[PDB]
Write a protein that binds this ligand. Structure first.
Ligand SMILES: *[C@@H]1O[C@H](CO)[C@@H](O)[C@H](O)[C@H]1NC(C)=O
Lengths: 39, 49
């Protein structure tokens, strides 16, 4: 869905919090406290 | 084995990276698309071919 600046990708999988695009979701997690993106 | 009932044509076929069945493959191939912009196409629009 384009590209994302300011959120780091993690190799995990949670439930969707903020829908971004084709299977990618974003959340505000602790892994400190920052925005992360995941499948 | 499910009592003699054959479910191999609706169960997934993992030979291909998209874990889809045979009938689902036929359904996805028959519906032709308009090539919508859900995948990015700015590089192809820039290069005038
Ligand atoms: C189920 O059907 C497919 C094709 O119709 C066939 O190749 C396969 O051998 C069948 N399964 C069994 C257990 O015979």
């Amino acid at each position: 869905a384009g590209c994302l600046i300011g959120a780091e990708y993690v190799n995990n999988s949670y439930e969707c919090d903020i829908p971004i695009g084709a299977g990618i979701c974003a959340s505000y997690q602790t892994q400190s406290q920052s925005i992360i993106a995941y499948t | 084995y499910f009592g003699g009932f054959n479910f191999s044509q609706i169960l997934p076929d993992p030979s291909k990276p998209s874990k889809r069945s045979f009938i689902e493959d036929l359904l996805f191939n028959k519906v032709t698309l308009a090539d919508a912009g859900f995948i990015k196409q700015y590089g192809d629009c820039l290069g005038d071919i």
